[PDB]
Design an enzyme around this catalytic site. Structure first.
Site, PDB file in Angstrom:
ATOM      1  CG  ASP A   7      11.651  14.522   5.727  1.00 34.18           C
ATOM      2  OD1 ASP A   7      11.532  15.492   4.945  1.00 34.18           O
ATOM      3  OD2 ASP A   7      11.269  13.364   5.438  1.00 34.18           O
TER       4      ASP A   7
ATOM      5  CB  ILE B 170      -0.976   0.062   1.201  1.00 29.93           C
ATOM      6  CG1 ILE B 170      -0.219  -0.074   2.525  1.00 29.93           C
ATOM      7  CG2 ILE B 170      -2.032  -1.010   1.062  1.00 29.93           C
ATOM      8  CD1 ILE B 170       0.229   1.234   3.126  1.00 29.93           C
ATOM      9  N   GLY B 171       1.958   1.222  -0.707  1.00 28.82           N
ATOM     10  CA  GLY B 171       2.822   2.384  -0.766  1.00 28.82           C
ATOM     11  C   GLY B 171       4.282   1.982  -0.843  1.00 28.82           C
ATOM     12  CE  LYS B 172       6.227  -0.010  -5.392  1.00 26.96           C
ATOM     13  NZ  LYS B 172       6.744  -0.793  -6.550  1.00 26.96           N
ATOM     14  N   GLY B 173       8.632   3.364  -1.791  1.00 29.27           N
ATOM     15  CA  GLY B 173       9.565   4.471  -1.673  1.00 29.27           C
ATOM     16  C   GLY B 173      11.002   3.999  -1.785  1.00 29.27           C
TER      17      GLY B 173
ATOM     18  CG  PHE C  67      10.855   3.755   2.947  1.00 31.33           C
ATOM     19  CD1 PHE C  67      10.123   4.121   1.829  1.00 31.33           C
ATOM     20  CD2 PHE C  67      10.291   2.880   3.852  1.00 31.33           C
ATOM     21  CE1 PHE C  67       8.857   3.624   1.620  1.00 31.33           C
ATOM     22  CE2 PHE C  67       9.019   2.376   3.645  1.00 31.33           C
ATOM     23  CZ  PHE C  67       8.302   2.749   2.529  1.00 31.33           C
TER      24      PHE C  67
ATOM     25  CD  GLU D  97       6.857  -2.819  -1.788  1.00 29.75           C
ATOM     26  OE1 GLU D  97       7.714  -3.723  -1.628  1.00 29.75           O
ATOM     27  OE2 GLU D  97       6.146  -2.725  -2.818  1.00 29.75           O
ATOM     28  CB  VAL D  98       4.690   0.936   3.916  1.00 23.06           C
ATOM     29  CG1 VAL D  98       4.141   1.917   2.936  1.00 23.06           C
ATOM     30  CG2 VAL D  98       3.637   0.593   4.941  1.00 23.06           C
TER      31      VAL D  98
HETATM   32  C1  LIG Z   1       6.708   8.110   3.642  1.00 23.63           C
HETATM   33  C2  LIG Z   1       5.833   7.058   4.279  1.00 23.63           C
HETATM   34  O1  LIG Z   1       4.864   6.600   3.663  1.00 23.63           O
HETATM   35  N1  LIG Z   1       6.276   6.737   5.559  1.00 23.63           N
HETATM   36  C3  LIG Z   1       5.650   5.802   6.353  1.00 23.63           C
HETATM   37  N2  LIG Z   1       6.183   5.003   7.231  1.00 23.63           N
HETATM   38  C4  LIG Z   1       5.169   4.247   7.773  1.00 23.63           C
HETATM   39  C5  LIG Z   1       5.470   3.240   8.798  1.00 23.63           C
HETATM   40  C6  LIG Z   1       4.800   1.994   8.813  1.00 23.63           C
HETATM   41  C7  LIG Z   1       5.117   1.057   9.802  1.00 23.63           C
HETATM   42  C8  LIG Z   1       6.084   1.364  10.755  1.00 23.63           C
HETATM   43  F1  LIG Z   1       6.383   0.475  11.694  1.00 23.63           F
HETATM   44  C9  LIG Z   1       6.730   2.610  10.700  1.00 23.63           C
HETATM   45  C10 LIG Z   1       7.779   2.960  11.713  1.00 23.63           C
HETATM   46  N3  LIG Z   1       6.428   3.552   9.730  1.00 23.63           N
HETATM   47  C11 LIG Z   1       3.948   4.612   7.189  1.00 23.63           C
HETATM   48  C12 LIG Z   1       2.558   4.202   7.328  1.00 23.63           C
HETATM   49  C13 LIG Z   1       1.991   3.913   8.611  1.00 23.63           C
HETATM   50  C14 LIG Z   1       0.632   3.520   8.726  1.00 23.63           C
HETATM   51  C15 LIG Z   1      -0.179   3.411   7.584  1.00 23.63           C
HETATM   52  N4  LIG Z   1      -1.483   3.039   7.713  1.00 23.63           N
HETATM   53  C16 LIG Z   1      -2.229   2.952   6.567  1.00 23.63           C
HETATM   54  C17 LIG Z   1      -1.689   3.229   5.305  1.00 23.63           C
HETATM   55  N5  LIG Z   1      -0.377   3.607   5.148  1.00 23.63           N
HETATM   56  C18 LIG Z   1       0.389   3.703   6.271  1.00 23.63           C
HETATM   57  C19 LIG Z   1       1.739   4.089   6.171  1.00 23.63           C
HETATM   58  N6  LIG Z   1       4.298   5.598   6.295  1.00 23.63           N
END
Ligand SMILES: CC(=O)Nc1nc(-c2ccc(F)c(C)n2)c(-c2ccc3nccnc3c2)[nH]1
EC number: 2.7.11.30
Length: 328
Positions: free
Chosen positions: A163, A41-44, A46, A48-49
């Site tokens: 940031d 549900i999202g990449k980068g 760093f 990807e998440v």
């Molecule tokens: C730039 C960006 O998208 N950064 C980013 N880092 C994280 C993340 C996720 C898990 C985690 F353990 C940590 C420390 N950070 C997330 C993030 C966190 C919760 C989210 N919930 C729903 C959708 N997208 C999400 C995205 N977004």
């Protein structure tokens, strides 16, 4: 972890547990390794998440690429600092690792917020003048608690997001934002005056003037706290710049879109901020509501091309805390 345990019981047992620290490693590990990834549900860069469930409970799983291991460590290091766990700071659940060499897998597991980042919420919807405050106040309640240098037993050292931007801010169900993505963040120990730092970081856009023309002093842990605000300022602009007041709610736009090309450079940004000392033109139609102006106030109260000159984080916290009482 025993049969029937729920992520809730974990977290609860945790907060209310002896120390205000994360879960036991072995437990964090058990969690990460038993999570059931759903779908990306999202990449980068760093990494990807993904979105995943842990025994049914949704969860967020940021999966780094071995090459980006330090980015993984820092966050893991920070989200676990002695007692940082505000309501506006992304609930950290666990961090884990898995292979060897080239394929080492590094994960960070947090809490899942359907809504996503502001940069997505501000594009999908158009907040209320009332909501604009919850969103802007919380961000502020957050950046405050992050700079909030406590001291003593386990005083959370002052931290600087390094940031802050529309994408690293997540919004909950009740329209409450929360800081996130503390990767580039730095700590500051008050008992030995230190900084675990180390050059020009962060998103080439929300970069504060100090950094852009390099004339910033990293020796004093303020140049950091300071830049946090300016950036948090730009973020306020977007929020209201997408606020509705009877029909008029100008399309979402990133700060400095009409001045410098999409995906700016240090040079292309240094010209419209350092030199021209130009900021996102706050449309005249803004001096409408008593609240809307308070923002236009702070927004420039932050856009000062001068470090110390900017408002403190704790401040905007108190001011928007009051404007919250009298309004709504
Ligand atoms: C730039 C960006 O998208 N950064 C980013 N880092 C994280 C993340 C996720 C898990 C985690 F353990 C940590 C420390 N950070 C997330 C993030 C966190 C919760 C989210 N919930 C729903 C959708 N997208 C999400 C995205 N977004």
């Amino acid at each position: 972890i025993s049969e029937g345990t729920t992520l809730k019981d974990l977290i609860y047992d945790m907060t209310t547990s002896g120390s205000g620290s994360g879960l036991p490693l072995l437990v964090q590990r058990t969690i990460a390794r038993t999570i059931v990834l759903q779908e990306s549900i999202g990449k980068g860069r760093f990494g990807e998440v993904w979105r995943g469930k842990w025994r049914g409970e949704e969860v967020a799983v940021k999966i780094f690429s071995s090459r980006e291991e330090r980015s993984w460590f820092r966050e893991a290091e920070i989200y676990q600092t002695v007692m940082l766990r505000h309501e506006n700071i992304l609930g950290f659940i666990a961090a884990d690792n898995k292979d060897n060499g080239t394929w080492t897998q590094l994960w960070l597991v947090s809490d899942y917020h359907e809504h996503g980042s502001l940069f997505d919420y501000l594009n999908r919807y158009t907040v209320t003048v009332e909501g604009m405050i919850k969103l802007a106040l919380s961000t502020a309640s957050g950046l405050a608690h992050l700079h909030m240098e406590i001291v003593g037993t386990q005083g959370k050292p002052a931290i600087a997001h390094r940031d802050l931007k529309s994408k690293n801010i997540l919004v909950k169900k009740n329209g409450t934002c929360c800081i996130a993505d503390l990767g580039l963040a730095v700590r500051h120990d008050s008992a030995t005056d230190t900084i675990d730092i180390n050059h020009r970081v962060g998103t080439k856009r929300y970069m504060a003037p100090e950094v852009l023309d390099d004339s910033i002093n990293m020796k004093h842990f303020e140049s950091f706290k300071r830049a946090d605000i300016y950036a948090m300022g730009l973020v306020f602009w977007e929020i209201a710049r997408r606020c509705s007041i009877g029909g008029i709610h100008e399309d979402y736009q990133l700060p400095y879109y009409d001045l410098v090309p999409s995906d700016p450079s240090v040079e292309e940004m240094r010209k419209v901020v350092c030199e021209q000392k130009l900021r996102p033109n706050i449309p005249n139609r803004w001096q409408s509501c008593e609240a809307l102006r308070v923002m236009a106030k702070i927004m420039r109260e932050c856009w000062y091309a001068n470090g110390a000159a900017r408002l403190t984080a704790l401040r905007i916290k108190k001011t928007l805390s009051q404007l919250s009482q009298q309004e709504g």
